[PDB]
Amino acid sequence: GISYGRKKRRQRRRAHQ
RNA sequence: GGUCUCUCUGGUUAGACCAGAUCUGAGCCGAAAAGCUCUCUGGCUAACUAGGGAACC
């Protein structure tokens, strides 16, 4: 998860339930 | 003439490597902000291998 893009995906994934 | 020493190309395998994918790939954890592990695709890096070239004897 060190990559900034995964943080975006992790946040996007959390936002969609 | 011999030799993978270097280098490039193809291939195989791997990788606490770089990107992207649940704006619809999956699991784990927390009360939560978050965190952890994967899978798929492109690339990179390393090992090994064949071949071209170079280098050395």
Residue numbers in the entry: 44 to 60
Could you share sentences copied from the article?
The HIV-1 Trans-Activation Response element (TAR) RNA, located at both ends of its RNA genome, is one of the most conserved RNA structural elements in retroviruses. It assumes multiple, dynamic conformations to carry out critical functions in several stages of the HIV-1 life cycle, including reverse transcription, proviral transcription, genome dimerization and packaging, viral translation, and immune suppression, etc. Here, we report crystal structures of the full-length HIV-1 TAR which reveal substantial conformational mobility in its three conserved bulges and in its lower stem, which coordinately maintain the structural fluidity of the entire RNA. We find that TAR RNA is a robust inhibitor of PKR, and primarily uses its lower stem to capture and sequester PKR monomers, preventing their dimerization and activation.
Herein we report four crystal structures of this 57-nt RNA, both free and bound to HIV-1 Tat. In both cases, Tat induces a substantial conformational change which positions U23 in the major groove of the A27-U38 pair, forming a base triple. In both the co-crystal and NMR structures, the central U23•A27-U38 base triple is sandwiched and stabilized by two G-C pairs (G26-C39 and G28-C37), as well as by two Tat arginine side chains (R52 and R56/R49) that are co-planar with the flanking G-C pairs. The guanidinium groups of R52 and R56/R49 not only form hydrogen bonds with the Hoogsteen edges of G26 and G28 but also stack with the base triple via cation-π and van der Waals interactions. Essentially, these two flat guanidiniums mimic third nucleobases in the major groove (like U23), forming two pseudo-base triples (R52•G26-C39 and R56/R49•G28-C37) which sandwich the central bona fide U23•A27-U38 base triple (triangles). Unlike the NMR structure, the crystal structure places R49 of Tat in direct contact with G21, making yet another arginine fork interaction with the Hoogsteen edges similar to R52 and R56. Tat projects the guanidinium groups of three arginines, R49, R52, and R56, to recognize the Hoogsteen edges of three guanines, G21, G26, and G28, respectively, with R52 making a central, indispensable contact. Strikingly, while the flanking R49A and R56A substitutions each had only ~ 3-fold effects on binding, the central R52A reduced binding by more than 400 fold, in agreement with its in vivo importance for Tat-mediated HIV trans-activation. Any nucleobase at position 24 sufficiently supports Tat binding, consistent with its solvent exposure and cation-π stacking with R55 of Tat in the co-crystal structure. Although our Tat helix-TAR structure seems to require the crystal lattice for stabilization, it demonstrates the structural feasibility for a conformationally constrained Tat helix to fit in the TAR major groove, induce the U23 triple formation, and make highly similar contacts.
